[PDB]
Every structure is written in C-alpha cells, then in structure tokens.
Amino acid sequence: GSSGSSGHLNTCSFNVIPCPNRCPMKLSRRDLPAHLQHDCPKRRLKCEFCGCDFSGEAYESHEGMCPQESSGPSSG
Ligand SMILES: [Zn+2]
Ligand SMILES: [Zn+2]
C-alpha cells in the first residue's frame, strides 16, 4: 500500500552507482541524469517563501502555489 506521503525504508540495491549530489540514494549509470533533475532529495532546491526542500516536479508548480507565501518562521 501507499499511504503517508513521507520518507520510506531503503533496500540494498546492486550493480548501481551512488548519487553525485552526495545524497544517500543510488540509481545506476542511466537513471543518474533522471535523479538529479527531480528525483533527488538533496537536489539543493529550497523555496524562497516557505523555505522547504522540494523536488523538480514540485518546485516548478510550487513557485506559484506555495503554502507559506508570506507567513514564515517565528525567530529567523
Ligand atoms: Zn540524489
Ligand atoms: Zn513554498
């Protein structure tokens, strides 16, 4: 089943390569260019409003639909 919408366990993949982004996630020598695009966690992309790491599929359509466009953190 798929419920929760959050981080999930991780298996021990084989015959693959680590991510250059320095993230604890390996894909392979083919899905590499498809992981650092919008499939990488440490892709290094934080919102300018809500300031919350996001993917490429979100950071894109999230630029206009941000949960914290104004309201921000208490101290910071
Ligand atoms: Zn990665
Ligand atoms: Zn945002």
Please name which of 28, 30, 68 lies closest in space to residue 48, comparing C-alpha atoms.
Answer: 68
- Cα(18) to ligand 1 centroid in Å equals 8
Question: Do the domain assignments include residue 1?
Answer: no
DSSP 26: B
> Dihedrals φ, ψ of 16, to 5°?
-135, 180
The ligand that comes nearest to the alpha carbon of residue 39 is 1
> Dihedrals φ, ψ of 57, to 5°?
-80, -20
Question: Do the domain assignments include residue 24?
Answer: yes
State both tokens at 17.
């390569």
CB distance 17 to 26 below 8 Å: yes
Question: Do the domain assignments include residue 36?
Answer: yes
Question: Do the domain assignments include residue 2?
Answer: no
Number of domains comprising the chain = 1
Q: Which domain holds residue 29?
A: 7-72
Question: Do the domain assignments include residue 51?
Answer: yes
State both tokens at 37.
């695009």
What is the domain-level CATH number for residue 66? Answer: 3.30.40.10
Q: Is 40 left (phi over 0), alpha (psi -120 to 50) or beta?
A: beta
- Cα(74) to ligand 2 centroid in Å equals 16
Experimental method: NMR
With residue 60 as reference, give the H or E element that holds it. helix 56-61
Alpha-carbon distances, residue 66 vs 1, 37, 49, 56, 62 (angstroms): 28, 20, 7, 14, 5
Residues 6+ positions from 40 with CB-CB distance below 8 Å? 19, 21, 23, 25, 55
